[PDB]
């Protein structure tokens, strides 16, 4: 029933964890209090905490979770963005906003990404008149 060892992070990864700004100009900042929530809502979603210590687990989450955000909650999304931090941390990367992390973490937290899409317009037929012959 027990297992986590101190916390998620290390000493260091805390002291970097100890001010990840939530939103671009919302002022307020991440703390380990918010991790402790996160690794809460995670591990109590379906997950294991020390499992989320490790980039292996934080992957097994951030994989299952990105999809499962459509299914989970906007509060999974806090679970997500703060996961994608704690992934950013466990890997190597440190961050300053979450979405900054989720930028690294959007990029598979190493590199590489494309996307495209296009589409363009679709309508038009009949809506006029001639009167005469």
3-state secondary structure the chain: CCCCCCCCCCHHHHHHHCCCECCCCCCCECCHHHHHHHHHHHHCCCCCCCCCCCHHHHHHHHHHHHHHCCCCCHHHHHHHHHHHHHHHHHHCCCCCEHHHHHHHHHCCCCCCCCCCCCCCCCCCCCCCCCCCC
Give the Cα separation of 121 and 119 in Å (integer).
7
The answer to whether the beta carbons of residues 96 and 21 sit under 8 Å apart is: yes
Give the Cα separation of 87 and 103 in Å (integer).
12
Closest CA to 4 of 64, 62, 44: 44
Angle between helices 32-43 and 74-91 (to 10 degrees): 110
Statement: 1-133 belongs to CATH 1.10.150.90? yes
Give the residue carrying structure tokens 């996961």.
83
């Amino acid at each position: 029933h027990m297992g986590a060892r101190a916390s998620v992070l290390s000493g260091g990864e805390l002291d970097k964890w100890e001010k990840i700004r939530l939103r671009p100009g919302g002022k307020k900042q991440y703390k380990l209090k918010h991790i402790v929530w996160a690794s809460r809502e995670l591990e109590r979603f379906a997950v294991n905490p020390g499992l989320l210590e490790t980039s292996e687990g934080c992957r097994q989450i951030l994989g299952q979770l990105q999809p499962s955000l459509q299914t989970g909650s906007e509060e999974l999304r806090s679970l997500y963005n703060t996961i994608a931090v704690l992934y950013c941390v466990h890997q190597r990367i440190d961050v300053k906003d979450t979405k900054e992390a989720l930028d690294k973490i959007e990029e598979e937290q190493n590199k590489s990404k494309k996307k495209a899409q296009q589409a363009a317009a679709d309508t038009g037929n009949n809506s006029q008149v001639s009167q005469n012959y």
